[PDB]
């Protein structure tokens, strides 16, 4: 038990980085609740449902990753592994139905792409509705299994360095999942751009598509791509204690997505504008 | 018979109208009864509610 | 009411030359494109020309489009086509048309049906 | 107040039963496209409706074309009992997919009439939207038409003389340059009209076909799946 | 010899121009000036109705000012509640491309028509409970553009083949013809004594027919472009016409000429539907830039606006007592107003 490290400044950063991104992802993804929940016709499409339950997910890992972070590094915790392990799976699913809502606007909008004269019937409210809950539950068994077993000292496991009661095999399960969710993702939408290209400005013979989907991209990457990269390097230990004194503060990127996916997603919505507009 | 039926009809608005009645006649009996039924109750979509 | 009353054209030599106007009453001239069409005997009314609210996107049908010249006078409120070099398939007679509706760029003005913004017409021998 | 519990429950329960049969009917409104057939009486407009009836009718003026393509469904409505003064009526069709236009580019005395009507209907208000599928329809009777000579275009369009075939053109293999250049001249005689205004809210789809050709549903689908994929590419925020 | 007749109508309209001069000894605008003006009018959406998959193309209500019957293009024909919102009936129709719906007077019955030139007449109150087609009047060669009932058994309707209509329900056969426009008729009104109607036609012009003798009574033009909406002053003495040109005109029938025009500078779009208030004094016309506008109709000056659609405003009307005022557009919503 020493993944307490961080100079008082430092704390005060962490402190201060945590407290005001969380402020923001609540207010943002409570503000995009209400538009999407004030208007009718914005709920009934399957597209909106989706942006949703990023919006609940943003919320949730916001709420309880702020809650958790603090308590752990800063207002050193005595903690214990099934309760320690409850809050980790509490943020865990948060995050991965973060993930898994990305997934499933991504796909969504690459079925009207892809098929867009059977984008109306392939996918459907009943279909929409059934997809994001078996998400949620696939994300909520994720979280749980570290409870019931994916232990490393309750298991006999080689263990990590992170998280104290988690287990390598888990946190390589986790990151595969996450990163073939966010394959799809970038190829989903490079697939978009390709088709608007091929068409749009190749077949007549789009400055703000493609601006919006770079902006989509790099907001991806720049908060989970040196997360996953530091979880890989940590997995197979390829340094010592210099790694994860920045792994504290590289998850606050997490929040920051939280905070800015309402912006890039919601806000960047003529239907979602026009509702917030007319209240 | 066209041009014979559109001549006849305009002989008929021609004759036993010549414009019967005047402007000043026409224009008060409408406003008269635009403001005779405008009462507060009468008319709802007024300034009354 | 509107009214359109076209007048000039008549007897001419074929290759001679023409102006063919157009007096417009009951509406602006300003607001609307106006047209010249045409129907020759044996067949039915085709379009000639027209002429957009300044007079800036002249256009001609192609069997007129170096002869004729339409051109539209507002503080007039006339219509004029200029017809030169005339053959005997201009032997037409030639309507003022008017499009339905002002600040439009589409016009219906070709109906056989009696389009109500049309002139009486002026018959045109070549 | 019994009676009036009981009205409005009653009342609650016969619009809660039409609001699910009006999301029933909802679920296949959404589910068709509808498409506006047009041209003048010369052009095969029935012909193609014929052929894709092969692949449905109508008899109160409007002759009403049901199909299929990939489970796809198109209704597609010939509205053939009014008068010829359609500036009213059309104004029905300002939520349909696509209008279907159908040339008989054989005879160029009515080509300009045909050109005439492109323009009015891409200008319109409420058409200004709508993207306009173009068939060229009797390709076979222009290729005769224009190898018989003594039918000089010519006369009717003074600027094809001064018009080459463009680089870009897919003539077919046994095909005279001639009947491409005459076939091409008035493709664009029709493409100048649609790219001039309307900039990227509708496109114009040429195509050439011959009397008798099986490939119009096919081509009328990808046309219609090429506009509504630029409606959604339109949804992200542009417009 | 058609010059002869030619010569002898253009006579006719000078007589009838020299005529309204020598009558024009005034205007509507002169001596309403010292009238209070109605002041800036607000009225905000009192109930919004949501169940039409497409365009609303027209409406009307019911004279118990409460039901109100609605149309639209996807081929529905839903009867309203306005009070509660709900959905009273649910009609589908045999052709979605429906141009016009009427409710009758005693409310037992509802009639619609369009692109099909067929007038369709569903009685609501059936025995069964379920509402069927009651009758299909045919006739009509052009779409049919408006529909009133003059009672549970004849029907007034206009078409697109320039004529007009009175058809006895009961035999289904047309009682007359009223035959005197040049283009679509696109709008009627039923006088209150229901002993004349007023058609605007494609034409620029207006034509009061007397429905008994079906002749054309009066002619009315000034209108530059063609009319697309029009209704009876309470009085039954006047009509409001609103026309493409962007403009409304008001017309007194014994006048015979054309008393008030209600027009603005930055409105180039034109009128897609014309009512009156209970008492006149108020002219809604709800216009092509989706905005519906209030008119004094006395003083010709805008005194309110119904901003609130997304798109063309088709349809609009007011209930019999005027309690309210339910406009329909293209974005499938209707609206209750007060
Ligand atoms: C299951 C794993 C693989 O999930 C992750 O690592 C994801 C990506 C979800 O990020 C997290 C980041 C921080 C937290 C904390 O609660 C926390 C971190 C350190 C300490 Cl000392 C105490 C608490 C949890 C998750």
Redesign the pocket.
């Given at each position: 038990e020493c993944?307490?490290v961080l100079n008082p400044s430092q704390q005060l950063a962490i402190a201060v980085l945590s407290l005001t991104l969380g402020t923001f992802t609540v207010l943002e993804n409570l503000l995009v609740l209400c538009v999407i929940l004030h208007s009718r016709s914005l709920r009934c499409r399957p597209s909106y449902h989706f942006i949703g339950s990023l919006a609940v997910a943003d919320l949730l890992g916001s709420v309880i990753?702020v809650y958790?972070?603090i308590?752990?590094?800063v207002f050193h915790r005595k903690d214990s592994r099934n309760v320690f392990l409850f809050?980790?799976?509490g943020?865990?699913a948060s995050?991965?139905a973060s993930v898994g809502s990305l997934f499933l606007i991504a796909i969504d909008r690459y079925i009207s792409i892809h098929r867009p004269l059977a984008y109306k019937r392939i996918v459907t409210r009943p279909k929409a509705v059934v997809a994001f809950c078996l998400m949620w539950t696939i994300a909520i068994v994720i979280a749980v299994l570290?409870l019931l077993g994916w232990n490393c000292e309750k298991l006999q496991s080689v263990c990590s360095d992170?998280?104290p009661h988690?287990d390598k095999t888990?946190?390589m399960f986790?990151?595969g999942v996450?990163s073939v969710l966010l394959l799809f993702i970038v190829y989903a939408y490079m697939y978009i751009l390709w088709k608007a290209h091929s068409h749009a400005v190749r077949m007549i013979q789009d400055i703000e598509l493609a601006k919006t989907l770079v902006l989509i991209l790099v907001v991806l990457i720049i908060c989970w791509g040196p997360?996953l990269a530091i979880?890989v390097y940590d997995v197979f230990g390829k340094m010592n204690k210099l790694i994860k004194t920045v792994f504290?503060f590289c998850?606050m990127l997490?929040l920051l997505n939280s905070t800015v996916n309402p912006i890039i997603y919601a806000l960047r919505s003529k239907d979602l504008r026009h509702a917030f507009r007319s209240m | 018979t066209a041009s014979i039926a559109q001549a006849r009809k305009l002989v008929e608005q021609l004759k036993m109208e010549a414009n019967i009645d005047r402007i000043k006649v026409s224009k008060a009996a409408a406003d008269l009864m635009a403001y005779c039924e405008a009462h507060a109750k009468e008319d709802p979509l007024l300034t009354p509610v | 009411q509107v009214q359109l009353q076209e007048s000039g054209g008549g007897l001419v030599q074929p290759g001679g030359s023409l102006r063919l106007s157009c007096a417009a009453s009951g509406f602006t001239f300003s607001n609307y494109k106006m047209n010249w069409v045409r129907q020759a005997p044996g067949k039915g009314l085709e379009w000639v020309s027209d002429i957009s609210q300044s007079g800036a996107s002249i256009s001609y049908t192609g069997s007129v489009k170096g002869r004729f010249t339409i051109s539209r006078d507002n503080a007039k409120n006339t219509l004029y086509l200029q017809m030169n070099s005339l053959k005997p398939e201009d032997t037409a007679v030639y309507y003022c048309a008017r499009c339905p509706a002002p600040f439009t760029r589409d016009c219906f003005d070709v109906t056989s049906t009696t389009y109500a913004y049309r002139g009486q017409g002026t018959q045109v021998t070549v | 107040t019994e009676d009036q519990r009981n009205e409005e429950k009653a009342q609650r329960e016969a619009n809660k039963k039409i609001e699910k049969q009006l999301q029933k009917d909802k679920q296949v409104y959404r589910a068709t496209h509808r498409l506006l057939l047009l041209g003048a009486d010369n052009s095969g407009k029935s012909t193609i409706v014929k052929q894709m009836r092969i692949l449905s009718g109508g008899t109160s003026g409007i002759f009403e074309t049901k199909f299929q393509v990939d489970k796809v469904n198109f209704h597609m409505f010939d509205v053939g009992g009014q008068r010829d003064e359609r500036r009213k009526w059309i104004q029905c069709f300002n939520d349909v997919t696509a209008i279907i236009f159908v040339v008989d580019s054989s005879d160029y005395n009515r080509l300009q009439e045909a050109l005439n009507l492109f323009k009015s209907i891409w200008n319109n208000r409420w058409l200004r939207t709508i993207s306009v599928i173009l068939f060229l329809n009797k390709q076979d009777l222009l290729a005769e038409k224009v190898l018989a000579g003594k039918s000089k275009i010519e006369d009717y369009f003074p600027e094809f003389a001064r018009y080459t075939t463009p680089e870009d053109a897919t003539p077919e293999p046994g095909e005279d340059p001639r009947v491409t250049r005459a076939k091409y001249f008035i493709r664009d005689e029709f493409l100048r009209i649609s790219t001039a205004s309307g900039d990227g809210r509708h496109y114009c789809y040429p195509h050439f076909t011959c009397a008798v050709d099986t490939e119009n549903a096919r081509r009328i689908f990808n046309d219609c799946k090429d506009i509504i994929l630029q409606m959604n590419l339109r949804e992200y925020n542009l417009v | 010899e058609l010059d002869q007749l030619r010569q002898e109508a253009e006579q006719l309209k000078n007589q009838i121009r020299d005529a309204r001069k020598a009558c024009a000894d005034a205007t509507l605008s002169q001596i309403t000036n010292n009238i209070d003006p109605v002041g800036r009018i607000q009225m905000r959406t009192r109930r919004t109705l949501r169940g039409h998959l497409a365009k609303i193309y027209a409406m009307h209500w019911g004279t118990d000012s409460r039901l109100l019957v609605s149309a639209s293009q996807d081929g529905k024909l839903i009867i309203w509640d306005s009070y509660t919102t709900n959905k009273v009936h649910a009609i589908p129709l045999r052709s979605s491309w429906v141009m016009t719906c009427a409710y009758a007077p005693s409310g037992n019955y509802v009639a619609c028509g369009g692109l099909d030139n067929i007038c369709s007449i569903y009685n609501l109150k059936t025995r069964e409970g379920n509402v069927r087609v009651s009758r299909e009047l045919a006739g009509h060669t052009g779409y049919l553009s408006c529909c009133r009932f003059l009672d549970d058994n004849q029907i007034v309707t206009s078409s697109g083949d320039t004529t007009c209509a009175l058809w006895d329900i009961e035999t289904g056969q047309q009682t007359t013809t009223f035959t005197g426009h040049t283009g679509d008729v696109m709008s009627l009104s039923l006088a209150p004594d229901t002993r004349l109607f007023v058609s605007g036609a494609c034409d620029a012009s207006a034509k009061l027919w007397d429905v008994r003798e079906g002749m054309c009574r009066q002619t009315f033009t000034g209108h530059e472009s063609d009319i697309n909406a029009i209704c009876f002053f309470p009085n039954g003495n006047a009509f409001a016409t609103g026309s493409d040109d962007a403009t409304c005109r008001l017309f007194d029938l014994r006048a015979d000429q054309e008393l008030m025009t209600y027009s603005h500078d930055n409105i180039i779009c034109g009128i897609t539907s014309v009512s009156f208030s209970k008492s006149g004094r108020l002219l809604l016309a709800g216009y092509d830039d989706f905005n519906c506008n209030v008119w004094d109709a006395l003083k010709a000056d805008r005194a309110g606006v119904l901003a609130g659609h997304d798109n063309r405003v088709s349809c609009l009307g007011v209930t019999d007592d005027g309690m309210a005022v339910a406009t329909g557009s293209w974005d499938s919503f209707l609206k209750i107003w007060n």
């Open positions: 993944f307490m990753f958790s972070f308590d752990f590094h809050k980790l799976g943020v865990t995050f991965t570290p992170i998280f988690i888990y946190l986790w990151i996450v997360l979880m504290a998850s997490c | - | - | - | -």
